[PDB]
Design a protein around this ligand. Structure first.
Ligand SMILES: NC(=O)C1=CN([C@@H]2O[C@H](COP(=O)(O)OP(=O)(O)OC[C@H]3O[C@@H](n4cnc5c(N)ncnc54)[C@H](O)[C@@H]3O)[C@@H](O)[C@H]2O)C=CC1
Ligand SMILES: NC(=O)C1=CN([C@@H]2O[C@H](COP(=O)(O)OP(=O)(O)OC[C@H]3O[C@@H](n4cnc5c(N)ncnc54)[C@H](O)[C@@H]3O)[C@@H](O)[C@H]2O)C=CC1
Ligand SMILES: OCc1ccc(Br)cc1
Ligand SMILES: OCc1ccc(Br)cc1
Ligand SMILES: [Zn+2]
Ligand SMILES: [Zn+2]
Ligand SMILES: [Zn+2]
Ligand SMILES: [Zn+2]
Lengths: 374, 374
């Protein structure tokens, strides 16, 4: 009955960097051809949304952020074939158009229609479905989930299991899938290996889940916040180290612990120095290091190419290397089948209008994932 | 008739950086336990030997350099089991001890007994078998092939086919195996792919041969010396580009030519800037870039980690990823069965005594490989 009409609803608008989110009355346009309007049910607070606030991650402002979510389709634009009204869906911050060179490649997942490489903060058609007091508000990675309703391109939404618990499976829209995929698909962690995981937030915990599932014998968590260690150990870390405890660099510590370097290292923080440390701590001849952390805007790292010439492999990935539309439904089905657990990532559940409390919890170190419910 | 005796013979000693080789009389000690004394038959001039002269590659001086060679066992020390006097052999600049965690790993080839990481310029026992003007002279990578006779540890030599032509198969000791392996083993180049090869010296031409053997559709040779193009085209390059002919940076040209980036790129020069350019020109979601070139001592490159976060893989390797002692005899067997060609890499043959003309041919851009004969 809202189909074909403007919806007036509340959304959390970020007007300016380094300011609180502002709960505003917005108008959400109806979906145009090949667009889907979604009623949000749950959205997760991911450190990448905080990067927008901090200016680490540049995207046009003002913006409705939020990219880790699950909802129900309220209506569909002309030509939509992959979802219908009433369907449970997860928005895909990495699209899967199915037609570009990457979508056709067996391994690649970074679809050329993504709004990550050179963010415009629009729909695919280069316009916005959001207005606040006459002013257009930017989209974020084609998702924009910090709103009661959003509009996404059909290539940026997957239908999921009609019985799935949206307050849990929203994590499959980013943090779980990124971390788990980084281990099982990108690194391809092997049985009996030694893994080091830098950063023990939601995404690093999911890296640990991935390494345990892949049969790693040793999984060393690294965090400057020792409060993170207990939960890292619960999901499979065999050991945890705090670099602040040591009078020498942690790559030397991890090299001695691993008897000459780890098989697999993961940077899951977003700092240039830990990207180089994670590479250095993997074994010089056959080690693999995966960058998961989003670096600070426009900054270059410095590294010695002899770390690679010896044999190391260095790679990164978006969304755990998962082809998003193909994988997100299968990951939900796997969750429904008890193949992995999401409750260990969820430390707080707040109503949407307490979003700023949700971000305060993240910034303080006290949360892993806060889920915002509608 | 020389067994158990000190040999007096000619060697090319490097006394000082940025000086000509000095062809003079040296004393070569007989082999100790698990050592092998070799009469050199042929040695190639590799750019890495020139890096020792220029100080780009640091190793203790004074030194007998050379690492790409073939010869005949003159005598063996006590306990040697894998070669006998009169055997044809190729010295291994990357050893294969068979005992260490790398030698036991299925992918690893950078044996922990190597003298590359932290060069000492000795035998495994920390002493030298060379005297000149009554001074001890350093070894180079446990090989030292710029001498009529050398002594190597048993883990640094492979027995090859008794009928092999040593004046060709010396190239399997470095440049051929390194390039070819970088393509077929390290990159694992796929059928129907697009490859970019930066540098069309002996190692780059070898990378092209591996790219053609792997069934690459397109192989784009890149070099600032257009005199290199003809030979590159003969051994499988489909196109050759000189960066100096374009206004745009060559990563931009290759990305255009490949309709969004190459599948596989190779840095086969040894410059920081071309290592980053080669990484950039591989497709951002699934490209693989392999560093082969030896960078200047102790220098860091600067790069944007968003190149990796999109999904690129960056790696490097020594000796094309080959387990040296397992691989080198198989590579000689494959050569004898004409599975690959070495003649295209050999542009000049000179007597050993003309080593300095050898280096001048390389430095001028005129040669690919000069083979020195003893
Ligand atoms: N590649 C991708 O597709 C994705 C990237 N990310 C990124 O992954 C990273 C992690 O995200 P979350 O787990 O949500 O963040 P989070 O902030 O919950 O976790 C980061 C952890 O790193 C630790 N840390 C900070 N500085 C450290 C240091 N110097 N040394 C060791 N530990 C340090 C913190 O104590 C914290 O526990 C972020 O950069 C985020 O933007 C998130 C999802 C998708
Ligand atoms: N990783 C390993 O195990 C091995 C490494 N190497 C290294 O591989 C590299 C190549 O060795 P070779 O083929 O013997 O050397 P080479 O000097 O014959 O060939 C290098 C080629 O690169 C070209 N070049 C120089 N600057 C260039 C630029 N800015 N752009 C494009 N091309 C440029 C030169 O014109 C030349 O044709 C060297 O750094 C050498 O030390 C060699 C053998 C083993
Ligand atoms: O967490 C979402 C996200 C992932 C990667 C980048 Br780059 C930006 C945002
Ligand atoms: O070409 C011989 C050699 C290869 C790699 C390095 Br590093 C140094 C020398
Ligand atoms: Zn696509
Ligand atoms: Zn996220
Ligand atoms: Zn070894
Ligand atoms: Zn060489």
């Amino acid at each position: 009955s809202t189909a074909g009409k403007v919806i007036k609803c509340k959304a959390a608008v970020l007007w300016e960097e380094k300011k609180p989110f502002s709960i505003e009355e917005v108008e959400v346009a109806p979906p145009k051809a090949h667009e889907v309007r979604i009623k949000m049910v749950a959205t997760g607070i991911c450190r990448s949304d905080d990067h927008v606030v901090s200016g680490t991650l540049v995207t046009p402002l003002p913006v409705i952020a939020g990219h880790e979510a699950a909802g129900i389709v309220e209506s569909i634009g002309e030509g939509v074939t992959t979802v219908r009204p009433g369907d449970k869906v997860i928005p895909l911050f990495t699209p899967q158009c199915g037609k570009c060179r990457v979508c056709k490649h067996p391994e690649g997942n970074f679809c050329l229609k993504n709004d990550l490489s050179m963010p415009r903060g629009t729909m695919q058609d280069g316009t916005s479905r959001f207005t606040c007091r006459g002013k257009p508000i930017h989209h974020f990675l084609g998702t924009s989930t910090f709103s009661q309703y959003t509009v996404v391109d059909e290539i940026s939404v997957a239908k999921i299991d009609a019985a799935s618990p949206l307050e849990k499976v929203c994590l499959i829209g980013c943090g779980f899938s990124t971390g788990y995929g980084s281990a099982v698909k990108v690194a391809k962690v092997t049985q009996g290996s030694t893994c080091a995981v830098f950063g023990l937030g939601g995404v690093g915990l999911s890296v640990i889940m991935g390494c345990k599932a892949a049969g790693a014998a040793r999984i060393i968590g690294v965090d400057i916040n020792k409060d993170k260690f207990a939960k890292a150990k619960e999901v499979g870390a065999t050991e945890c180290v705090n670099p602040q405890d040591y009078k020498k660099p942690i790559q030397e510590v991890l090299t001695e612990m691993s008897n000459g370097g780890v098989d697999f290292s993961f940077e899951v923080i977003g700092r240039l120095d830990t990207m180089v440390t994670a590479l250095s701590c993997c074994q010089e001849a056959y080690g693999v290091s995966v960058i998961v952390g989003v670096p600070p805007d426009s900054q270059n790292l410095s590294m010695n190419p002899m770390l690679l010439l010896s044999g190391r492999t260095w790679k990164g990935a978006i969304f755990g290397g998962f082809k998003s539309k193909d994988s997100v439904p299968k990951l939900v089905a796997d969750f429904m089948a008890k193949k992995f657990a999401l409750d260990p990532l969820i430390t707080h559940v707040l109503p949407f209008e307490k979003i700023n409390e949700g971000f305060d919890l993240l910034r303080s170190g006290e949360s892993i994932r806060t889920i915002l419910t509608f």
